[PDB]
Amino acid sequence: SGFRKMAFPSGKVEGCMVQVTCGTTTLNGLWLDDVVYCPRHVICTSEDMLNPNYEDLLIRKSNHNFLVQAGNVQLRVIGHSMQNCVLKLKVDTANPKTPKYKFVRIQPGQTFSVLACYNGSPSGVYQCAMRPNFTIKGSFLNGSCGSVGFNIDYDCVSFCYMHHMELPTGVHAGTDLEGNFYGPFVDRQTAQAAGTDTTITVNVLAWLYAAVINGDRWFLNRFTTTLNDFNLVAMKYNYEPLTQDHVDILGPLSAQTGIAVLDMCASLKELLQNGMNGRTILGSALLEDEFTPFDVVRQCSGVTFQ
Amino acid sequence: SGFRKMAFPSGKVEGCMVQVTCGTTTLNGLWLDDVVYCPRHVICTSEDMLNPNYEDLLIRKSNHNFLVQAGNVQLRVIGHSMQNCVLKLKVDTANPKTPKYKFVRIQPGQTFSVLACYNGSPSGVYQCAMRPNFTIKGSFLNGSCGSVGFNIDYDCVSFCYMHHMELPTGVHAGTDLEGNFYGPFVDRQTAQAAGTDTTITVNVLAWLYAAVINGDRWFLNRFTTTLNDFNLVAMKYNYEPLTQDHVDILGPLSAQTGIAVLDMCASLKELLQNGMNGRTILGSALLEDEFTPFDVVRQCSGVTFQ
Numbered sequence: 001s002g003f004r005k006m007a008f009p010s011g012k013v014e015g016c017m018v019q020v021t022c023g024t025t026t027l028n029g030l031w032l033d034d035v036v037y038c039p040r041h042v043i044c045t046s047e048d049m050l051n052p053n054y055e056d057l058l059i060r061k062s063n064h065n066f067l068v069q070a071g072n073v074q075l076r077v078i079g080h081s082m083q084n085c086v087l088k089l090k091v092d093t094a095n096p097k098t099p100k101y102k103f104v105r106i107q108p109g110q111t112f113s114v115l116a117c118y119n120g121s122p123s124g125v126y127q128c129a130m131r132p133n134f135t136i137k138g139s140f141l142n143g144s145c146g147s148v149g150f151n152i153d154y155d156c157v158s159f160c161y162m163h164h165m166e167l168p169t170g171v172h173a174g175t176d177l178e179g180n181f182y183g184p185f186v187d188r189q190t191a192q193a194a195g196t197d198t199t200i201t202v203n204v205l206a207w208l209y210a211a212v213i214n215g216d217r218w219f220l221n222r223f224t225t226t227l228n229d230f231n232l233v234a235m236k237y238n239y240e241p242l243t244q245d246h247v248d249i250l251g252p253l254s255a256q257t258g259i260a261v262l263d264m265c266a267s268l269k270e271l272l273q274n275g276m277n278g279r280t281i282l283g284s285a286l287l288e289d290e291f292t293p294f295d296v297v298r299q300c301s302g303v304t305f306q
Numbered sequence: 307s308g309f310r311k312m313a314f315p316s317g318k319v320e321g322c323m324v325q326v327t328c329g330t331t332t333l334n335g336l337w338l339d340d341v342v343y344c345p346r347h348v349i350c351t352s353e354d355m356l357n358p359n360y361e362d363l364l365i366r367k368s369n370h371n372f373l374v375q376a377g378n379v380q381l382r383v384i385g386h387s388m389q390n391c392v393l394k395l396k397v398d399t400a401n402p403k404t405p406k407y408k409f410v411r412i413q414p415g416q417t418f419s420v421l422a423c424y425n426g427s428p429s430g431v432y433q434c435a436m437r438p439n440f441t442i443k444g445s446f447l448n449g450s451c452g453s454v455g456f457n458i459d460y461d462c463v464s465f466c467y468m469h470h471m472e473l474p475t476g477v478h479a480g481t482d483l484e485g486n487f488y489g490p491f492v493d494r495q496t497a498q499a500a501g502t503d504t505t506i507t508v509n510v511l512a513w514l515y516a517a518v519i520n521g522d523r524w525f526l527n528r529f530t531t532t533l534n535d536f537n538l539v540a541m542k543y544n545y546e547p548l549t550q551d552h553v554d555i556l557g558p559l560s561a562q563t564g565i566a567v568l569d570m571c572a573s574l575k576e577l578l579q580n581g582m583n584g585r586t587i588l589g590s591a592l593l594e595d596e597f598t599p600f601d602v603v604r605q606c607s608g609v610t611f612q
């Protein structure tokens with residue numbers, strides 16, 4: 001029993017982290033086979049960053065301008081190229097610690113683990129969700145760019161995020177590992193802003209099931225609601241619509257607890273209209289929306305990874 | 307910016323996790339040099355566990371009764387012994403992945419990372435605090451015993467916890483790596499209960515400083531209080547006393563924010579007496595007490611580990 005915000009074990013990713021230095025800029029790179037991936041704004045300097053032309057900037061660079069450190073071992077860069085907002089540095093050594101991996105792009109509402117890194121050295125690991133507005137509520141300081149987000153499926157690491165920047169509200173934006181940003185953000189200095197967010201309804205329901213599985217039942221009731229009537233309430237409280245596919249995804253958790261999905265919707269409705277009355281759910285006084293149904297099943301059942 | 311419950315990168319510990327099977331019981335072991343450490347209740351069976359005599363049970367065992375799996379490689383047990391509530395299985399192979407390590411015992415109020423494991427395979431990593439009542443609010447299922455808790459200091463892993471059991475309120479108890487329980491718990495079936503807990507005051511103050519550093523200031527005020535007058539309020543709300551040493555430990559965070567410790571105590575006082583009025587701090591609607599001052603400085607400043 002118990003329910004924690006849980007990340008994947010980070011060892012497979014730690015072995016891929018390197019330090020990339022170009023000019024005055026040092027950030028992190030991801031070393032897989034004989035390529036190091038990193039944010040392309042590494043080729044920028046403090047007056048380049050206002051409105052740079054990266055193609056112009058890159059043709060001016062040399063392989064030897066890129067300093068790559070794998071711990072205390074220097075990797076010779078033998079080629080470079082740009083792919084969207086990432087740089088691909090070809091090195092003369094394949095990473096002997098390369099795990100089985102995939103480059104995947106995730107959906108808003110899905111979760112992943114972040115290995116925060118500085119100077120190519122892992123600092124910490126934590127769990128994030130991709131918000132509906134394509135930002136993530138991370139924890140990142142100067143020098144964290146190139147840190148990556150990932151999921152692990154048995155022995156395969158699915159990389160889904162590389163960190164690029166902080167927005168003015170303190171949330172974070174970045175790209176998939178093909179260099180394509182999540183959301184309408186650019187790797188430049190403009191007045192970029194997040195844009196309105198919503199609460200991930202299916203995740204809140206999954207967490208309520210996590211609570212029931214763990215013995216928190218005070219919010220349960222005998223009432224039910226229809227999907228349409230629930231979604232009218234969701235609209236009003238800035239929750240995203242619940243679809244029939246969400247209902248279907250919640251089926252297993254429904255069956256394990258014996259609480260019909262629409263019955264849990266009725267409970268959520270009352271929580272939204274009444275609040276919590278000084279009470280808590282799984283140690284929170286807010287409705288938590290950064291656990292997916294998968295996250296709940298994995299934790300409340302015990303899936304491992306080799 | 308941002309503030310997350312952050313664990314240490316788990317790779318150094320993943321390389322030490324093995325599977326230990328004796329009879330019908332399978333749990334996790336920690337493999338360091340040529341010793342595998344695991345909970346001694348592995349030698350128990352489903353009628354042994356009511357009130358066992360472990361010395362009697364252990365002299366009845368043979369080296370070959372202990373099945374140790376390091377991934378898909380079997381480790382030959384060449385000796386065994388009991389140390390308090392842990393078993394030490396000597397194996398004929400030293401773990402080539404042994405990190406630099408220490409066995410440390412932590413204080414209530416301190417934090418650590420947990421690498422939850424099943425069948426010798428890491429499942430997830432999360433951050434825990436040792437509660438004032440010596441329990442931890444973990445996330446553990448059947449088969450998780452022998453999972454360990456740890457901190458990392460540059461390149462050295464300080465192991466501080468091995469998981470042994472779940473208490474009836476769903477919280478968890480275990481031992482240090484010398485096999486000595488945290489708190490008044492035993493590895494038997496009795497009617498053990500946690501016992502009353504309190505809130506870790508110095509940690510709540512550290513988190514309030516984390517909030518200020520991150521731009522949450524609505525709870526700040528022009529009032530101050532004395533240490534004695536604050537502690538009268540702490541008493542009433544089941545918070546542990548704040549000492550002068552706590553004040554001193556908060557000095558750096560005080561200096562970075564320009565908010566005197568006793569001024570932040572005055573803010574905490576009003577939060578305790580008034581509540582939060584529908585407002586949040588660092589994404590929480592409760593006063594959070596599982597971040598130490600060290601945790602705050604590490605995250606809001608960017609310390610790494612090699």
Ligand SMILES: *[C@H](O)[C@H](C[C@@H]1CCNC1=O)NC(=O)[C@@H]1CC2(CCC2)CN1C(=O)OCc1ccccc1
Pocket residue numbers: 027041044049140141142143144145146164165166167172186187188189307
């Ligand atoms: C990469 O290490 C850094 C990560 C940031 C720093 C603070 N917290 C983070 O997550 N990225 C970074 O600084 C990027 C790089 C660019 C340069 C071209 C794009 C700028 N930038 C950024 O985050 O912009 C924030 C900003 C807004 C307004 C003025 C100055 C900076």
Ligand SMILES: *[C@H](O)[C@H](C[C@@H]1CCNC1=O)NC(=O)[C@@H]1CC2(CCC2)CN1C(=O)OCc1ccccc1
Pocket residue numbers: 001333347350355446447448449450451452470471472473478492493494495
């Ligand atoms: C180890 O895998 C397991 C971890 C528990 C299981 C559920 N969540 C956890 O953290 N430990 C475990 O089962 C220990 C082992 C003993 C056997 C002698 C000590 C029993 N035990 C335990 O947790 O007791 C809980 C319990 C209380 C009342 C009746 C039955 C079990």
